[PDB]
DNA sequence: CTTCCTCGAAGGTTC
DNA sequence: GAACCTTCGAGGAAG
């Protein structure tokens, strides 16, 4: 498989990786389970992969589910009842599970037990069930949307961040060997620059560039070929996608840089307002291409010079 | 062969089919000697 | 041609058409099926017809279904057995599929096999179902509701776009030959300009013009008749209806461009709130004639110069 | 009968009437069925009446149902199975059909066939050439895919004084009542542009002429009858006049808020906004402003007050 | 009885009563059913009473139901079809029928037929049910809540007005003879002037005065007993309640007549903003004691001469 | 017990007691049910208590329910079917009923009948239910939410007032006798002045003082123990809390008495804008410590001398 | 275990402990339950622990739930039917309970009864439930957000405050005593100074420092080792979190110190307003880093000199 | 899925 | 320019 299995193979995330090593080995010296750990950050940074690495370093079998996959307390009760001592449970988008599901998790995390009422009318009893020692691993895209009392239960916080050019270039090379593709150190740098920090994007771009090089070339990925392929795929030199270019172009040409409301913009381009604000705007904000104001979004001077329009 | 028959019926039920309908669907298969995979495959193919 | 079979015949969509050619040829130069593909765009552009063309270019048979028709995992698994090695499965409105099946769908896509788990949970056993290689082609209008695991499986993305005048004009010409009518290129250009970029609208205008040209004329659509027909109907040269012109005029004449509330505007033109917001208002925003603000709608400078009124901030 | 049967009897609607004649004649010349027609607009303008005229001109038998009656897909499938070649299906209040039924209907409109599931069983149907006709007051409430399948759109408009004058005279002959040319014009001015309102006034005046007169409508009886009903020469009702008077005498023309005006006339807030203001705004007696609503110069001249900006 | 039964007994409402007489007489000469009638207006003015009087003058039986009772089309389809020629159907609180049911009346009122689905499954069919001539009568306080296509079908509209002192005096005297109490005409005028123009309030005051006159008096109502009883109830000669008087006094003694805001005034009287604006403010404005302006409420000269202050 | 059982035990509310006595006595002589009555006013003044007193004086069994306990008209019909002649039905917090149900009472209150739909659905018809004489009693904290047609049907209205020091002092003594404690007359007067004129508050303080006097004292609530106990609770000799004192102190120390705006003051006190206006400001205004003005609010001389600062 | 269980073990909160001791002891001489108690204040200070201590002192069982966990009245009714005489019910985040649920407590807390509709169809009937004696304990972050009728029924109030430097030092020493570990007084003081006066933070930091001292040190915590561990984590030398640095850095660089609206700041940093208002802003205010004014928040000079900027 | 209602904006007066 | 007051418009959450 492409994904790494041990801390030696996992490139980057030096801070998170360095912290986890100390805690994982310390837990072994005391012969006890690892404290509950929360991983968070932009999608595709490797949160899921890290969970598998932790399991191998611990020597445990991973179990998995997701917030949207759990809809009733009985589901989590069954899941938690289907646990073995030392097991590691990974829950994707732990913040999306309903408020009724967290009820079970608080006592499960802190005391490792659950309580279920039984009986009706004049009859009323409950069953208190002990849980074996386990390690919950949660992952989310947004930390501020997690339940405050739940957030307080996590003992370790792992903040993922974007990879730098040295790491992404090494990841591109690693993957290229699996495809038996010949790529020079120059071409690998171009893909790393325009993949805007995300390994998942780099792997997808590489496969698409390969198909072009196998026809419009002799199967050798040259820097000249990579640039021609990237323009055919409509990928900007700044890593702006087709949708990103469409947004900036519309604000400058139709609104003089704004201000413009999210609804008006989302109606001009055939997009859902919830998608624009969740998928695309976050990246454009972090790079300062779009700024938020009382009257709406505004394109900065940086955007004008990039697109090639004279600023006012 | 009752093990393969029960397995195929149980597997069909695991896909959400009703016990009665799954039993009938598998009961519609003639060959008992064929493996559960062929039974469930033939059952689903015949049910399409 | 109106019904195409190869990219050589499909009108428009040159961007997506050029990209798919390369990926299909690279797939043929190997013993591999085409990567899982996802098609995006507004409704009515031809996403379904594009699937038939890809199937013919690949030299494979096409299976067709829709998201709502799949209610349980057994439904999908049954269809998957019908697929021969390399077959293409097209799922329309894939975003409407149920979450219970989503778990099964992406699993088979990645592994080409399905594992079934049976038993009480304490004692359980698995069975392995090997599947032939296949290509899934999904079509959707709403993407922000697709789950992250599903999105990650699709390796190719294609965006559909509104047809431009040079391409939309040819659709009118080809359609005009199915019927028995002659049309001058200058007349065809006038219809394409008013078709809002949608083939289905261009056909509707052509049908209405045909009726006039054979009752009030010599059965030929010349530039003179097209102007008369386009005058009986009130479709403006920009594609604005009679009500659309009344909306813009009212905002400028009575409210000085706004801001004006939806309720106040509705009672002036004598229409329901839901009718102005869903029938007429959507197209006026795309053309940039109005904007939506916290305090109401406002007309832009582009509207003033189109209606012919002087503009002042 | 009250409802006209042919275009020669159908007064007004020159735009919609002129267009439909062209399309019907072309369809007959080709021996083809008419494209699907959608009729929409304000209440009482003639939408239902026009649907029957279209059938009489085409020379077909009309099937009639309504959206509120079709509650499940099985209902529609049963209805469609009875259609014969060239038949016309008319669905009133089409905006009420459930979304599960619309998905079935817009497919049959394009391909004339059905393949649907309905202890469940599969049903497949091949439909002959037919024309669907729909009438609604909330055209925006239909799904965007469905609207795209209609081939003809008819938007209704209000009538002019010469048209309503002729309609009043026609209805008077059905009631075998004698009415003068100048008396008919006095009722037309008060009918707000709607045929249904014009017919209602004639009914109320007829009852008065029979009890308080000699059973004949003349310029003198019309003045007495209209004075009893208290309908102004501009069509304003007793409460409409009270609204304008209050604004001019207590707030100097405004601006004033809707809540303040409602409490001063002892009316419910939603009754003033939805029952009385719509006509006053369309006729130009009142304007809405960011700070309230104000009476225009036209209101001052009508009520007889000295205007001041 | 307490509800008048014929136009001879129905005091007041000359405009509505005069019109209905002409239309009922004209309908009888033609031997046909009366057109559909809608009655609307403020509470307690006689809407429900007039509905019965119309039936007595028409000489037909009345079928009665209410808006809250009808919940599904099957109910209305069951009430219909049970009508006989010339029947009158009365629906009280017609404004709270479900909108899906109002649209069933569109055909019944204009053309006397209903599209009915008949049978079940494969036997399901559509047939025209057909109705005999009938008169629908509706009563409501919220006419603006009915749909525009429904209001357009009512052929007669009756808007009710408030009564005058002479009419209320006669109503009090009549009620004083349903019970067994002697009342001086001078005292009857004293109660009428305090009943705010509404017959229900006039009857309520009489009941309270009767109780006092037979417990703290000789069992007869005279100017002496009326003054004592009205002093216990604390109702001013203009009909102002204890709280009404407190509001005017506070505005004149602390703010010099205003302007003052509703929030500031409510806190000074220990009342809450929503009761003052809904219970007390309406009558004070309609009778000219208070004036609303862009800067707040202001007390008029009429309030000064009523409370006994000087309009400086 | 804590709740008075008869009018001879019920202290205060002289205005309401006097009226209710006359109406109850007159009802018995005629052998009739009492007219419907509505009790309303500020929280904790004695509304629920009065509803039981009325039932005991009439000598009838009381049926009890709750406004929010009724969810649909099917519930209300079932309740009304249980009424016996002369029964009293008490609905607490009647303002929480849904509008669809509130409109069913209109017929029941005026004519003692209800229209209902019955049958399997294939065969169904409307029928009248005829109810025996009964008295509806309602209590609400804010009548402004009740619809105009409902309030018009209540025949007797009772508006509750705040208690004065003479009357409130007796309530403290009576409660001490139930607890079998001994309280000095001067100490009872001290608790009343700090109870904001509300009986519920006076009872709460007495419980806390009683607990203290028997844990660190000799079992007597003398004037000396009261001061120590009240100082521990942090209740000023005028009933102001620390937050209330902080406001008056800030206005003098940072603004010289104002005028100052509410938004400005809120920041200097770390209090929420709307909370200050609704939670604390009302009592301070009614007692005369703060005064609203067109330019802002001002602390009166009374606020200066209470805080010990020098007035200027 | 870690959580204290008796007042002799519960460090700090002297003001709350002193009061609860008196009332708990007085409540034992009499044979009755303790009055309803409301605990409120910043999160993580130990109010949940206090509920366990009260139950252990009273000698009864403790049942736990939360407002968000109750969705409809039937849920709460089922819980109340499961209480034994003298039991304690603890409701966390009581201010977030839905209004339909809250109004059931008004009768239960004051009179120990509930009115409920039971059955369906013709079997529908009203029952009057009578509850056994019990004590409700509520916890909330915003005391000013409860409704007036609810807050008026709680008989005891307990405000909680941040721990001082000497108190946290003992908490660290106690925690480091349950675990077999050795900590120097100077290191324990430094670790407490970083803990924002919050015991939950102090316990979490100590656990991580212990892991580091076992792997990167000799198994003993010294100021040199503590500083290294605390510097490997994102804990600033004065406790600022990475979330805090982002806030101050964003305000100073993107808004020039403000004034800035908390809403626009929250959306620019992508954080929930409630978290900054309840968890972050209060500490930044109580330490002089953030100032506030009606226009908005302002960054003080102390913030500029800490982040390394120039207070221009 | 729809009606009610509550939150935010800004126009206008006054000191 | 700071503070009060009224009015309008678009969300959103509780039927
Ligand atoms: N006149 C009184 N004499 C003695 N105790 C009284 C008196 N009035 C009220 N109380 C007591 O005050 C407490 C609260 O009275 P309630 O009647 O429950 O208040 P309330 O009107 O019900 O408040 P609500 O229902 O929340 S609006 C009870 O302990 C009563 O016994
Ligand atoms: N540091 C890394 N080293 C190797 N592969 C990586 C790394 N980060 C991401 N990838 C690869 O990119 C994809 C990341 O997917 P995943 O880890 O599920 O992303 P996330 O969990 O962050 O959404 C996988 O195919 C994975 O193998
Ligand atoms: N006074 C104290 N002594 C010892 N430990 C405490 C003290 N206060 C709090 N803690 C510890 O810190 C945490 C407090 O959590 P909790 O009591 O739930 O706070 P809250 O109720 O505010 O959420 C627990 O782990 C508890 O053991
Ligand atoms: Mg019609
Ligand atoms: Mg009535
Ligand atoms: Mg009460």
Author numbering:
A (entry chain E), E (entry chain B), F (entry chain A), G (entry chain F): 19 to 330
B (entry chain G): 156 to 203
C (entry chain D): 19 to 331
D (entry chain C): 19 to 136, 141 to 331
Authors' description from the paper:
The central and universal element in genetic recombination as well as in double strand break repair and in the process of replication fork rescue is a four-way DNA heteroduplex called the Holliday junction. In bacteria, the Holliday junction is processed by two homo-hexameric AAA+ ATPase RuvB motors, which assemble together with the RuvA–Holliday junction complex to energize the strand-exchange reaction. Here, using time-resolved cryo-electron microscopy, we obtained structures of the ATP-hydrolysing RuvAB complex in seven distinct conformational states, captured during assembly and processing of a Holliday junction. We show that RuvB motors rotate together with the DNA substrate, which, together with a progressing nucleotide cycle, forms the mechanistic basis for DNA recombination by continuous branch migration.
The remaining seven RuvB motors can be grouped according to the number of bound RuvAD3, with one map lacking RuvAD3 (s0−A), two maps containing one RuvAD3 (s0 and s1) and four maps showing two bound RuvAD3 domains (s2, s3, s4 and s5), together suggesting a dynamic interplay between RuvAD3 and the RuvB motors. We found that cluster [A], which is positioned at the top of the staircase, contains either ATPγS (s1 and s2), ADP + Mg2+ (s3) or ADP (s4 and s5), a configuration that is consistent with a progressing ATP hydrolysis reaction at this pocket. At the opposing lower side of the hexamer, cluster [D] contains either ADP (s1), fragmented and interrupted densities (s2 to s4) or ATPγS (s5). In particular, we found that a single RuvAD3 is bound to subunit D during all five states, revealing that the RuvA–HJ complex is tethered to both opposing RuvB motors in tripartite particles throughout the entire nucleotide cycle.
